[PDB]
Amino acid sequence: MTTSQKHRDFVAEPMGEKPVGSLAGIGEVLGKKLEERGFDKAYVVLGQFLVLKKDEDLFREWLKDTCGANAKQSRDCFGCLREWCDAFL
Amino acid sequence: TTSQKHRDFVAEPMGEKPVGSLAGIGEVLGKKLEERGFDKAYVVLGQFLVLKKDEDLFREWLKDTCGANAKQSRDCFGCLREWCDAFL
């Protein structure tokens, strides 16, 4: 296992109303910027991931443009949503 | 009241189900959604989620996007809402 514990905790169960900061790669700084843009719950970011048809390039670019995420942060967030979807969607 | 199509959709994860598996989305609406990029049910779920599950805005978006009437958009909203309550 090379993922974080935080990734593993997110992908282990339905997300319900978890805040956006429950996503791997989304620390307090990125989480506040996402909340200020209306992406306050993790499921709203899931929504964007799905509207983009789970495309890595589009989602990771969107995250960068929306909250300033760097490459590692955006990879971690994408991977957490991708594995959650494989488990639950 | 619900259709069997609704109950079949809300009973299980949607995976890669086509957009036409959603209650309310018949052959005509489905084609118009596919033409606009919403080829899978989960892409419409995505829009429902981006809109924070807001009934008025989602049903209006669906009217604007594929011409859904009030019953079709009612049916589609209700199946996504109940799916999310079971699985999200």
Swiss-Prot record, chain B:
Domain of life: Eukaryota
Residue numbers carrying Phosphoserine: 3
Tissues where the protein occurs: Widely expressed. Expressed in colon, brain, heart, kidney, liver, lung, ovary, pancreas, placenta, prostate, skeletal muscle, small intestine, spleen and testis. Not detected in thymus and peripheral blood leukocytes.
One of the record's GO cellular component terms: cytosol
Outcome after substituting residue 13 to A: No effect on LEMD3/MAN1 and enhances histone H1/H3 binding
Location in the cell: Nucleus; Chromosome; Nucleus envelope; Cytoplasm
Protein name (record): Barrier-to-autointegration factor
Organism (species): Homo sapiens
Keyword Glycoprotein part of the UniProt annotation: no
GO MF term (any one): protein homodimerization activity
Effect noted on mutating residue 7 to E: Complete loss of LEMD3/MAN1 binding
Outcome of substituting residue 28 to A: No effect on histone H1/H3 binding
Impact reported for residue 61 to A: Complete loss of LEMD3/MAN1 binding. Enhances histone H1/H3 binding
Modification type N-acetylthreonine: residues: 1
Gene3D superfamilies: Barrier-to-autointegration factor, BAF
Function summary: Non-specific DNA-binding protein that plays key roles in mitotic nuclear reassembly, chromatin organization, DNA damage response, gene expression and intrinsic immunity against foreign DNA. Contains two non-specific double-stranded DNA (dsDNA)-binding sites which promote DNA cross-bridging. Plays a key role in nuclear membrane reformation at the end of mitosis by driving formation of a single nucleus in a spindle-independent manner. (Microbial infection) Exploited by retroviruses for inhibiting self-destructing autointegration of retroviral DNA, thereby promoting integration of viral DNA into the host chromosome. EMD and BAF are cooperative cofactors of HIV-1 infection. Association of EMD with the viral DNA requires the presence of BAF and viral integrase. The association of viral DNA with chromatin requires the presence of BAF and EMD.
Family to which this protein belongs: Belongs to the BAF family.
Residues annotated with Phosphothreonine modification: 1-2
Effect of residue 24 to Q: Complete loss of EMD binding and reduces dsDNA binding
Record comment regarding domains: Has a helix-hairpin-helix (HhH) structural motif conserved among proteins that bind non-specifically to DNA. LEM domain proteins bind centrally on the BAF dimer.
Gene: BANF1
Phenotype when changing residue 46 to E: Abolishes homodimerization, preventing ability to cross-bridge DNA. Abolished ability to mediate nuclear membrane reformation at the end of mitosis. Abolished ability to outcompete CGAS for DNA-binding, leading to innate immune activation
